[PDB]
């Protein structure tokens, strides 16, 4: 996505705002991410830079995410030599995925000085560098890179800055001249002729079918800033670029600002890794418990001779006067008047024999009670983990952090008021929820009354959510159903019924084994982020 074209567009379209922008504040929220709160054009604005390899970019965000509590070394070095700066000029580095800020600032003696901040966004080996104007000497560097990689250039401070080897590509018919169109798969080798290229862009342009026209038209489009910043979604795999989608089936959502496009599109992936690593373990336990009860059930089918012995003891105590001590059998009638032949021990008395039948009934009864208790335990656990996986599917990190501690408390694992999360709702209302079982319970109990309404699934497993004293209109009643169906055992399931019931009948009986009464149910379906 982040081609030299997108780059060059940004270069002009941010100089539109930040001619001589006064750098009011500097922060480094994450590792490979840096924020400047700059004052330009009589206004304060945010400026995010990222050398985060897959997410390396530049951006201006309404979401000033979080300035850190720790000022890191790189941040403080920027504060040393750029703070209170002045953004004289921006430059595109000749359309490569690289940018330059020509900046001015007074030194520690009030004498004006300048510098060249360079932002190379190459992909896996992007970087951010600061350099002197005249000397071209590097002063700071985010990813120091020693010449052990035997590379052309080097990062380290003090050294004369150098740029990468610019490839032998005509950065802007010439392809029909140079390249033999017989080659095929030319979406590959447009990269071999042009500077700012994505295989996405190359493919979408090659699919326009000899097509120099497409290239020239799109280059004129970009040069004229004629693009349309949208995000494309080809069955997921959400992509975005200056140009719209050209051919594929994917959905498209357009924007007014490339910056807002970047916004709505370093640590998220880490949290995802943690979440998946935990989800694996949870599924292992739930699957294990399910197979455990399968073992117990198929074992149970082989010791079930209780009632026979019960009935035999009954009959023998009823017929304890016709019976010799030494006999093998007993033709006996049931109290439907069948005639049963019960075996005996020819050594024992009928009293002894009947008592033995009662004993065996007692024993089988006991063992079955044991197995049924183990069944109850395992099924409770399985339902607990199933709700847990529902929550983890419909989770946020803020509740995942609580779920981890919940499980460490359950001792499946090993190693304070923020509870709920909400968004917009119908009737201009606010509907709060929690993907964590514990936070959901905290909200259901401590954050609402009894006469309020709880809305959850009318089905096996889903989250729990409600508005503060949820008594709004049917608009909000149906809007809560969308939030319920979104975070459920089957997201995007277009037949999910939601149950709405007074909180006064919310059963606070493992954890999150909450039954419900005073309930109604409405068939509904999942929805989009408009549910927010």
Partner 1 sequence: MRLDKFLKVSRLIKRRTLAKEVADQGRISINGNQAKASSDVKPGDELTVRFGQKLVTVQVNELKDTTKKEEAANMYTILKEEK
Indicate the helix (H) or strand (E) that contains 167. Answer: none
Among 41, 54, 223, 366, binds RNA (CB under 7 A): 54
| HEC per residue, 83-120 | CCCEEEEEECCCCCCEEEEEEEEECCCCCEEEEEEEEE
Angle of helix 437-446 relative to helix 397-409, nearest 10 degrees, comes to 100
Size of the site for RNA (CB under 7 A): 15
Report how far residue 241's alpha carbon sits from residue 97's, in angstroms, rounded to the nearest whole number.
14
Size of the site for partner 1 (CB under 8 A): 4
Q: How far is the CB of 205 from RNA (least distance, A)?
A: 19
Taking residues 234 to 273 in sequence order and writing x for each that binds RNA by CB under 7 A, - otherwise, the string is -----------------------------------xx--x
Position 148 contacts partner 1 (CB under 8 A): yes
**Contact assessment for residue 95 and residue 83, using Cβ atoms and an 8 Å cutoff:** no
Fill in the DSSP letter of residue 7: H
Position 151 contacts RNA (CB under 7 A): no
Position 124 contacts RNA (CB under 7 A): yes
**Contact assessment for residue 456 and residue 516, using Cβ atoms and an 8 Å cutoff:** yes
Site for RNA in 175-234 (CB under 7 A): none
What are the DSSP calls for 219-270, one per residue? HHHHHTT----EEEESSS-EEEESS---SSS-EEEE-S-HHHHHHH---HHH
Q: How far is the CB of 489 from RNA (least distance, A)?
A: 24
Position 150 contacts partner 1 (CB under 8 A): yes
Kindly indicate which of the ranges 142-150, 208-216, 423-431, 489-497 contains the residues binding partner 1, using the contact rule CB under 8 A. 142-150
Among 69, 107, 146, 235, binds partner 1 (CB under 8 A): 146
Q: Which does 123 bind (CB under 5 to 8 A by kind): partner 1, RNA, none?
A: RNA
Kindly indicate which of the ranges 140-148, 278-286, 385-393, 410-418 contains the residues binding partner 1, using the contact rule CB under 8 A. 140-148
Position 149 contacts RNA (CB under 7 A): yes
Residue 468: name the closest of 498, 493, 446, 501 by CA.
Answer: 446
**Contact assessment for residue 498 and residue 521, using Cβ atoms and an 8 Å cutoff:** yes
Residue 205: name the closest of 375, 3, 349 by CA.
Answer: 3
Q: How far is the CB of 158 from partner 1 (least distance, A)?
A: 16
Q: How far is the CB of 4 from RNA (least distance, A)?
A: 16
Q: Helix or strand or coil: residue 453?
A: strand
Q: Which does 124 bind (CB under 5 to 8 A by kind): RNA, partner 1, none?
A: RNA
Q: How far is the CB of 194 from RNA (least distance, A)?
A: 16
Among 68, 84, 123, 147, binds partner 1 (CB under 8 A): 147
- For residue 47, what are its two tokens? 């400026």
Residue 78: name the closest of 44, 115, 112, 113 by CA.
Answer: 115
CA within 13 Å, CB half, 417 = 2
Position 73 contacts partner 1 (CB under 8 A): no
Residue 481: name the closest of 468, 500, 460, 505 by CA.
Answer: 500
Q: Which does 268 bind (CB under 5 to 8 A by kind): RNA, partner 1, none?
A: none
Among 123, 343, 346, 410, binds RNA (CB under 7 A): 123
In the complex, the residues that contact RNA under the rule CB under 7 A are: 31, 53-54, 123-125, 149, 269-270, 273-274, 276-277, 355, 414
């Amino acid at each position: 996505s982040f081609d030299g074209m997108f780059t060059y567009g940004m270069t002009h379209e941010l100089n539109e705002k930040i001619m001589g922008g006064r750098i009011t504040k500097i922060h480094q929220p994450y590792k490979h991410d840096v924020i400047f709160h700059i004052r330009a054009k009589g206004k304060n604005q945010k400026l995010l830079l990222s050398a985060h390899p897959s997410y390396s970019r530049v951006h201006i965000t309404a979401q000033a995410y979080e300035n850190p509590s720790e000022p890191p070394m790189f941040c403080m070095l920027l504060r040393k030599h750029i703070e209170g700066g002045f953004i004289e000029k921006i430059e595109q580095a000749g359309l490569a995925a690289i940018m330059i800020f020509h900046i001015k600032s007074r030194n520690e003696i009030g004498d004006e000085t300048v510098r060249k901040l360079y932002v190379e966004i190459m992909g896996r080996h992007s970087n951010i560098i600061l350099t002197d104007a005249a000397e071209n000497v590097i002063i700071d560097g985010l990813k120091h890179l020693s010449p052990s990689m035997n590379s052309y250039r080097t990062v380290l401070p003090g050294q004369d800055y150098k740029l990468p080897p610019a490839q032998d590509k005509i950065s802007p018919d010439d392809i029909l001249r140079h390249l033999s169109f017989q080659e095929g798969r030319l979406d590959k080798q447009i990269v071999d002729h042009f500077s700012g290229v994505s295989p996405l862009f190359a493919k979408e342009a090659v699919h326009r079918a000899t097509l120099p026209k497409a290239l020239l038209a799109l280059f004129a489009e970009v040069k004229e800033h004629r693009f349309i910043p949208n995000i494309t979604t080809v069955n997921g795999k959400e992509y975005f670029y200056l140009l719209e989608l050209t051919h594929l089936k994917g959905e498209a959502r357009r924007f007014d600002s490339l910056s807002e496009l970047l916004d709505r599109f370093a640590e998220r992936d880490r949290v995802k890794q943690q979440a998946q690593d935990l989800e694996r373990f949870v599924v292992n336990e739930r699957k294990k418990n399910a197979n455990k009860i399968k073992k117990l059930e198929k074992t149970l089918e082989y010791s079930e001779n209780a009632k026979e012995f019960q009935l035999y003891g009954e009959l023998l105590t009823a017929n304890l006067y016709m019976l010799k001590k030494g006999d093998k059998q007993a033709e006996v009638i049931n109290y439907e008047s069948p005639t049963i032949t019960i075996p005996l021990n020819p050594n024992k008395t009928p009293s002894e024999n009947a008592q033995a039948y009662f004993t065996k009934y007692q024993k089988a009864k006991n063992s079955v009670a044991v197995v049924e208790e183990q069944i109850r335990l395992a099924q409770e656990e399985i339902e607990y983990f199933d709700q847990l996986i529902q929550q983890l599917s419909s989770a946020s990190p803020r509740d995942i952090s609580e779920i981890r501690e919940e499980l460490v408390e359950g001792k499946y694992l090993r190693p304070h008021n923020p509870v709920l999360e909400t968004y917009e709702s119908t009737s201009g209302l606010t509907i709060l929820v929690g993907k964590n079982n514990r936070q959901n319970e905290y909200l259901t109990t401590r954050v609402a009354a009894r006469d309020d309404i709880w809305l959850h699934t009318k089905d096996i497993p889903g989250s729990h959510v409600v508005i503060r004293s949820s008594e709004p209109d049917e608009q909000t009643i149906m809007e809560a159903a969308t939030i319920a169906a979104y975070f459920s055992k089957a997201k995007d399931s277009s037949s999910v019924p939601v149950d709405y019931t007074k909180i006064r009948h919310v059963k606070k009986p493992k954890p999150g084994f909450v039954t419900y009464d005073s309930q109604h149910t409405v068939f509904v379906t999942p929805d989009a982020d408009t549910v927010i």
